[PDB]
Design an enzyme around this catalytic site. Structure first.
Site, mmCIF file in Angstrom:
data_model
loop_
_atom_site.group_PDB
_atom_site.id
_atom_site.type_symbol
_atom_site.label_atom_id
_atom_site.label_comp_id
_atom_site.label_asym_id
_atom_site.label_seq_id
_atom_site.Cartn_x
_atom_site.Cartn_y
_atom_site.Cartn_z
ATOM 1 N N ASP A 255 0.816 -1.229 0.000
ATOM 2 C CA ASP A 255 0.000 0.000 0.000
ATOM 3 C C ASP A 255 0.833 1.254 0.000
ATOM 4 O O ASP A 255 1.800 1.357 0.774
ATOM 5 C CB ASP A 255 -0.928 0.094 1.242
ATOM 6 C CG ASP A 255 -1.912 -1.077 1.377
ATOM 7 O OD1 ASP A 255 -1.593 -2.160 0.859
ATOM 8 O OD2 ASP A 255 -3.002 -0.893 2.015
ATOM 9 N N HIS B 157 -1.076 4.573 -0.676
ATOM 10 C CA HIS B 157 -2.080 5.478 -0.109
ATOM 11 C C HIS B 157 -1.720 6.979 -0.256
ATOM 12 O O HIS B 157 -1.793 7.731 0.707
ATOM 13 C CB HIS B 157 -2.434 5.081 1.352
ATOM 14 C CG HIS B 157 -3.370 3.891 1.478
ATOM 15 N ND1 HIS B 157 -4.613 3.852 0.874
ATOM 16 C CD2 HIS B 157 -3.256 2.722 2.173
ATOM 17 C CE1 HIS B 157 -5.210 2.698 1.171
ATOM 18 N NE2 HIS B 157 -4.408 1.982 1.951
ATOM 19 N N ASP C 297 -3.981 -0.262 -3.535
ATOM 20 C CA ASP C 297 -4.129 0.818 -2.530
ATOM 21 C C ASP C 297 -3.161 1.985 -2.853
ATOM 22 O O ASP C 297 -2.295 2.305 -2.048
ATOM 23 C CB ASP C 297 -4.005 0.276 -1.050
ATOM 24 C CG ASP C 297 -5.325 -0.402 -0.501
ATOM 25 O OD1 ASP C 297 -6.221 -0.538 -1.370
ATOM 26 O OD2 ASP C 297 -5.456 -0.832 0.742
ATOM 27 N N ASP D 31 -6.356 7.388 -1.735
ATOM 28 C CA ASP D 31 -7.003 7.605 -0.422
ATOM 29 C C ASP D 31 -5.976 7.782 0.693
ATOM 30 O O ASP D 31 -4.849 7.332 0.555
ATOM 31 C CB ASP D 31 -7.964 6.470 -0.037
ATOM 32 C CG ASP D 31 -9.161 6.394 -0.923
ATOM 33 O OD1 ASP D 31 -9.483 7.388 -1.601
ATOM 34 O OD2 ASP D 31 -9.796 5.312 -0.938
ATOM 35 N N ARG D 32 -6.398 8.428 1.789
ATOM 36 C CA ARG D 32 -5.626 8.605 3.056
ATOM 37 C C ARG D 32 -4.545 9.689 3.024
ATOM 38 O O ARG D 32 -4.543 10.581 3.885
ATOM 39 C CB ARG D 32 -5.010 7.287 3.612
ATOM 40 C CG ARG D 32 -5.989 6.118 3.899
ATOM 41 C CD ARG D 32 -6.969 6.462 4.981
ATOM 42 N NE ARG D 32 -7.552 5.292 5.649
ATOM 43 C CZ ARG D 32 -8.416 5.363 6.669
ATOM 44 N NH1 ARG D 32 -8.817 6.544 7.140
ATOM 45 N NH2 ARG D 32 -8.889 4.250 7.222
ATOM 46 N N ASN E 99 -8.451 -2.672 -2.684
ATOM 47 C CA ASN E 99 -9.807 -2.335 -2.304
ATOM 48 C C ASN E 99 -10.117 -0.835 -2.402
ATOM 49 O O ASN E 99 -11.280 -0.457 -2.485
ATOM 50 C CB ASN E 99 -10.165 -2.928 -0.928
ATOM 51 C CG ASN E 99 -9.354 -2.348 0.220
ATOM 52 O OD1 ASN E 99 -8.083 -2.308 0.209
ATOM 53 N ND2 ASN E 99 -10.079 -1.989 1.295
ATOM 54 N N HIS E 100 -9.074 0.004 -2.397
ATOM 55 C CA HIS E 100 -9.238 1.462 -2.574
ATOM 56 C C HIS E 100 -9.316 1.926 -4.042
ATOM 57 O O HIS E 100 -9.635 3.094 -4.306
ATOM 58 C CB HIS E 100 -8.175 2.230 -1.772
ATOM 59 C CG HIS E 100 -8.435 2.208 -0.296
ATOM 60 N ND1 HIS E 100 -9.001 3.275 0.375
ATOM 61 C CD2 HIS E 100 -8.302 1.213 0.619
ATOM 62 C CE1 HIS E 100 -9.163 2.954 1.649
ATOM 63 N NE2 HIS E 100 -8.766 1.701 1.819
ATOM 64 N N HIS F 83 -4.033 -8.371 -3.416
ATOM 65 C CA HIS F 83 -4.110 -7.275 -2.430
ATOM 66 C C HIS F 83 -4.516 -7.791 -1.073
ATOM 67 O O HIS F 83 -3.782 -7.660 -0.118
ATOM 68 C CB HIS F 83 -5.068 -6.133 -2.848
ATOM 69 C CG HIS F 83 -5.109 -5.012 -1.847
ATOM 70 N ND1 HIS F 83 -4.093 -4.094 -1.746
ATOM 71 C CD2 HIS F 83 -5.982 -4.720 -0.846
ATOM 72 C CE1 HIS F 83 -4.345 -3.266 -0.743
ATOM 73 N NE2 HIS F 83 -5.501 -3.605 -0.187
ATOM 74 N N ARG G 212 -13.745 -5.874 9.484
ATOM 75 C CA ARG G 212 -14.023 -4.814 8.494
ATOM 76 C C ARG G 212 -15.487 -4.681 8.041
ATOM 77 O O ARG G 212 -15.864 -3.652 7.453
ATOM 78 C CB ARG G 212 -13.145 -4.961 7.257
ATOM 79 C CG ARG G 212 -11.663 -4.908 7.501
ATOM 80 C CD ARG G 212 -10.969 -5.054 6.183
ATOM 81 N NE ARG G 212 -9.559 -5.478 6.260
ATOM 82 C CZ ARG G 212 -8.534 -4.644 6.344
ATOM 83 N NH1 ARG G 212 -8.763 -3.342 6.412
ATOM 84 N NH2 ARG G 212 -7.291 -5.095 6.373
ATOM 85 N N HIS H 37 -2.441 -4.652 2.190
ATOM 86 C CA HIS H 37 -3.785 -4.390 2.798
ATOM 87 C C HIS H 37 -3.823 -4.081 4.312
ATOM 88 O O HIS H 37 -4.753 -3.413 4.773
ATOM 89 C CB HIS H 37 -4.713 -5.577 2.439
ATOM 90 C CG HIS H 37 -6.169 -5.374 2.700
ATOM 91 N ND1 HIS H 37 -6.880 -4.262 2.262
ATOM 92 C CD2 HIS H 37 -7.071 -6.215 3.284
ATOM 93 C CE1 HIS H 37 -8.150 -4.424 2.619
ATOM 94 N NE2 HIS H 37 -8.290 -5.597 3.233
HETATM 95 MN MN LIG Z 1 -4.671 -0.013 2.388
HETATM 96 MN MN LIG Z 2 -6.451 -2.513 1.239
#
Ligand SMILES: [Mn+2]
Ligand SMILES: [Mn+2]
Ligand SMILES: [Mn+2]
Ligand SMILES: [Mn+2]
Ligand SMILES: [Mn+2]
Ligand SMILES: [Mn+2]
Ligand SMILES: [Mn+2]
Ligand SMILES: [Mn+2]
Lengths: 5, 293
Positions: free
Chosen positions: B59, B61, B87, B90-91, B119-120, B168, B216, B243
């Site tokens: 990741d 991010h 990923d 995001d973040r 997943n992002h 991922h 989650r 992840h």
């Molecule tokens: Mn992540």
């Molecule tokens: Mn993830």
């Protein structure tokens, strides 16, 4: 914020 | 029509500037990156069959200055071959630069540079966790929708020399054969629970031995017995996944039959984690390069 802050 | 070399040059120009310094590409250039890379994604298998030597990253991010540190440590493409595990957005504060650089390198080096879906890279998630807001602030919402079309075509898994399975998130209770992955048709958002969802979202857990419930709210956890049976069935040696934030950037699970990689140090400005990258050589030896927080 759990989706993971 | 798309000047790839000039986009890369402008993205790399902020190397050694103050961290946080933006690169404002033109909207038409960003749209060009999305539409060209999407074409390449669709022409290549959804389950990548790759060969070593290869540097494998988790990741990112949107921590753009950390992505440049990974390349500084690992060799800027085409000096090394790369697989990223998802990923990208995001973040962090610079998802735009982050994804633009990785898509630019995919177009430039399409047989030596690889990106999996995380997943992002999914509209429902990137709406809430920062990428939508970043696009609204710096460009517009129509460009965010464009990225969404590109993300929907990303491949989902990779196998490195018939021996290292890469994704991922993790394993699925519906996963019986590698053909099931190959059957998955793109473009796809991820509208339903099931196999594709699990490959993006699932987690190892040492306190389940089979399948368990995921904190989650989606997908499952899987134990060591699951990892063992999978690696047996498909004649493999290791699962490589991402992840989850882990302290040293890499962490072994299930009696060293799985490794988690996380490539963004000091995640969110909150965790004191290192980032890491896994270098797999030509004789299938693995080593880890650590990015300090
Ligand atoms: Mn992540
Ligand atoms: Mn993830
Ligand atoms: Mn400066
Ligand atoms: Mn708009
Ligand atoms: Mn098979
Ligand atoms: Mn930690
Ligand atoms: Mn251990
Ligand atoms: Mn263990």
């Amino acid at each position: 914020x759990v989706x993971x802050x | 029509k798309l000047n790839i070399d000039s986009i890369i040059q402008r993205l790399l120009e902020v190397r050694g500037s103050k961290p946080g310094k933006n690169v404002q590409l033109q909207e038409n250039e960003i749209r060009g990156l999305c539409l060209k890379s999407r074409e390449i994604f669709l022409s290549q298998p959804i389950l990548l069959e790759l060969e070593a030597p290869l540097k494998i990253c988790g990741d990112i991010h949107g921590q753009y200055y950390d992505l440049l540190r990974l390349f500084e440590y690992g060799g800027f493409p085409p000096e090394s071959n790369y697989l990223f595990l998802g990923d990208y957005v995001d973040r962090g504060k610079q998802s735009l630069e982050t994804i633009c650089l990785l898509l630019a390198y995919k177009i430039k080096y399409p047989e030596n540079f690889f990106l999996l879906r995380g997943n992002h890279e999914c509209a429902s998630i990137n709406r809430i966790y920062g990428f939508y807001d970043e696009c609204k602030r710096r460009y517009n919402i129509k460009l965010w929708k464009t990225f969404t079309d590109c993300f929907n075509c990303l491949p989902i898994a990779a196998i490195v020399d018939e021996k290292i399975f890469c994704c991922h998130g993790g394993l699925s209770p519906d996963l019986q054969s590698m053909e099931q992955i190959r059957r998955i048709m793109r473009p796809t958002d991820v509208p339903d629970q099931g196999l594709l969802c699990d490959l993006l979202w699932s987690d190892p857990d040492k306190d389940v031995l089979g399948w368990g419930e995921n904190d989650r709210g989606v997908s499952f956890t899987f134990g060591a017995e699951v990892v063992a049976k999978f690696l047996h069935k498909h004649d493999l040696d290791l699962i490589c996944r991402a992840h989850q934030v882990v302290e040293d950037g890499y962490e072994f699970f299930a009696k060293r039959q799985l490794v988690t990689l996380f490539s963004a140090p000091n995640y969110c400005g909150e965790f004191d984690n290192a980032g890491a990258m896994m270098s797999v050589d030509e004789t299938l030896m693995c080593s880890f390069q650590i990015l300090k927080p």
